[PDB]
Amino acid sequence: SQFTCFYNSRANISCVWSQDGALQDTSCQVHAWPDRRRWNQTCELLPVSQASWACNLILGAPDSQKLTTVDIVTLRVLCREGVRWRVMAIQDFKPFENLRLMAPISLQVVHVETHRCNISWEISQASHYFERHLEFEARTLSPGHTWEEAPLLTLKQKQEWICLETLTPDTQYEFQVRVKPLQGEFTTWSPWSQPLAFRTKPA
Amino acid sequence: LPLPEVQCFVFNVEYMNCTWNSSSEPQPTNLTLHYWYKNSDNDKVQKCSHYLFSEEITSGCQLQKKEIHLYQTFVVQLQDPREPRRQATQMLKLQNLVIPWAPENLTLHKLSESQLELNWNNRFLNHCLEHLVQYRTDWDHSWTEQSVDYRHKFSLPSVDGQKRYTFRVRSRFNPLCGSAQHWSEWSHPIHWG
Amino acid sequence: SSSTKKTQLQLEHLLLDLQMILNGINNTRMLTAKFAMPKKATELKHLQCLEEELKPLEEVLNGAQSHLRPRDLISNINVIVLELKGSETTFMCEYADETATIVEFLNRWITFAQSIISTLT
């Protein structure tokens, strides 16, 4: 039974609450109570899976910096029993200890050859506090194989393109990338970008 | 009346060379350099105790590590020794004038058959440097460059085993401990094939 | 310890906030605004002098808008500074006898953070 939240580094904290046992059937919310800001915020938990609930605390506009590394936010799950709100879970949330960025966007083919392709991307809603302390992983879908079989291509630096070598001519590929900052004990990878389809030239 | 401009560089925070070109003077002249730091115990005006020469004339001063205070404002004074009132003073910010030595001990290792990692060392607090990595192959007509922070690693996630790679790296004292604009010399390159 | 690394990371974030303002400025009435300046700035309690100039900093950045969000930005600098500074005593920080322009102000506080960051490495 677990309560897990991540911050996109700007103005979005997303929470998942998993119950192990008796499932709630009344209203539950996440309540955000920052220790040094003048606002509180809430979101209504909706079912997402068989035993998990989720919702997003939108703290402001998409690219606005609403928290810092010194903020501590008391996050609580409150569920309705009769007329009263019961505190069902609680954490002291350190936003820059729990980062998960948005998946990279604007994937495009820069130049494609018979055996090579340069692909670029951008990050999104990413704090200036990271400077260049980010890394990426990419992967390529081949004709034979699945996404699970595709090897993870490591970029241990802020590099927003990849030149793929030793590809086959006139072949249909798909490409994905994900990002994370190096800061934070519980920080985790973004979701994978949307796959970009591309085709090598024929020779 | 107008003295030559002094230009100081702190080399790897080991010593500082301050130089000037005094061939703009009407005759050959040994100008003298004094210095002191603002807002400090080091108000006492110091005389250059290691002059540098160019065509047998003073053209610079070298300060040792002891005499360097990177974050205290540095005041350098050139003076005509035969004309006291003739003097020019500058205020330097030494933390923006650091030039690290080139990175060293470039090594490569395989993360997989087609993924390489470049690593290197600097004789310097790792945290205060950023780096520029350049690489190329025997198929390329030019270097590809990519910037790297204090982590000082560089991944190459898609390597062609048929190609021969060359790598080099340079470093800069920016932006966490200073805002220097000049890059080091390039490292000695290394190769892979 | 890792409270030293916590301090260091807080200083870095402050520094990046300041560098962002400075980079934003370098791309008229802004450059006539005058800022109080620290007489001495070598330890964290001296951030008192940065803290006290945040309201005038906010006002100047509001007047210049026509790629910054100054209410957010200043409120972020404010909480980071309050954490770094320590508990408030009398005589935290003393001012210099002359004021200065926004660029001299920002460079001074940038130089301050850089100076502490390099000793914590």
Ligand SMILES: *[C@@H]1O[C@H](CO[C@@H]2O[C@@H](C)[C@@H](O)[C@@H](O)[C@@H]2O)[C@@H](O[C@@H]2O[C@H](CO)[C@@H](O)[C@H](O)[C@H]2NC(C)=O)[C@H](O)[C@H]1NC(C)=O
């Ligand atoms: C606010 O964030 C949610 C959740 O996104 C996830 O968590 C974030 C912290 C970040 O790590 C993201 O990369 C994660 O994807 C966004 O909601 C999701 O949106 C996608 C696409 O529309 C959808 O498939 C999911 O169902 C959503 N998940 C939930 C729980 O609602 C939401 O869009 C974000 N909003 C803004 C304005 O940033």
Ligand SMILES: *[C@@H]1O[C@H](CO[C@H]2O[C@@H](C)[C@@H](O)[C@@H](O)[C@@H]2O)[C@@H](O[C@@H]2O[C@H](CO)[C@@H](O)[C@H](O)[C@H]2NC(C)=O)[C@H](O)[C@H]1NC(C)=O
């Ligand atoms: C943000 O929330 C906190 C805590 O919120 C809980 O406080 C409970 C008493 C109850 O109201 C519950 O529904 C709520 O979610 C608020 O702090 C509370 O505020 C009053 C003073 O105004 C105090 O009497 C309480 O002691 C205090 N509670 C705690 C636990 O300290 C806070 O006011 C609120 N802030 C905003 C801006 O809405």
Ligand SMILES: *[C@@H]1O[C@H](CO)[C@@H](O[C@@H]2O[C@H](CO)[C@@H](O)[C@H](O)[C@H]2NC(C)=O)[C@H](O)[C@H]1NC(C)=O
């Ligand atoms: C792959 O694509 C991009 C082109 O948009 C290249 O990266 C750019 O390189 C230029 C100089 O060549 C820089 O001024 C840009 O800032 C770079 N953009 C980014 C996002 O890094 C990249 O070099 C190409 N790769 C290869 C191997 O040629």
Ligand SMILES: *[C@@H]1O[C@H](CO[C@@H]2O[C@@H](C)[C@@H](O)[C@@H](O)[C@@H]2O)[C@@H](O)[C@H](O)[C@H]1NC(C)=O
């Ligand atoms: C310039 O200086 C040369 C050597 O240094 C000088 O000599 C010593 C003894 C001290 O006087 C020191 O301050 C000086 O830096 C001389 O050999 C040279 O002749 C000098 N030239 C001129 C034009 O003055």
Ligand SMILES: *[C@@H]1O[C@H](CO)[C@@H](O)[C@H](O)[C@H]1NC(C)=O
């Ligand atoms: C600096 O001055 C000293 C003494 O002249 C010399 O050893 C050193 O090579 C000079 N130049 C540089 C770039 O370090």
Ligand SMILES: *[C@@H]1O[C@H](CO)[C@@H](O)[C@H](O)[C@H]1NC(C)=O
């Ligand atoms: C490079 O390697 C040598 C020899 O193994 C070592 O003595 C030296 O310290 C290294 N240089 C740096 C800057 O770490």
Ligand SMILES: *[C@H]1O[C@H](CO)[C@@H](O)[C@H](O)[C@@H]1O
């Ligand atoms: C990102 O990727 C892998 C798989 O999701 C995990 O090791 C971990 O979540 C990491 O941050």
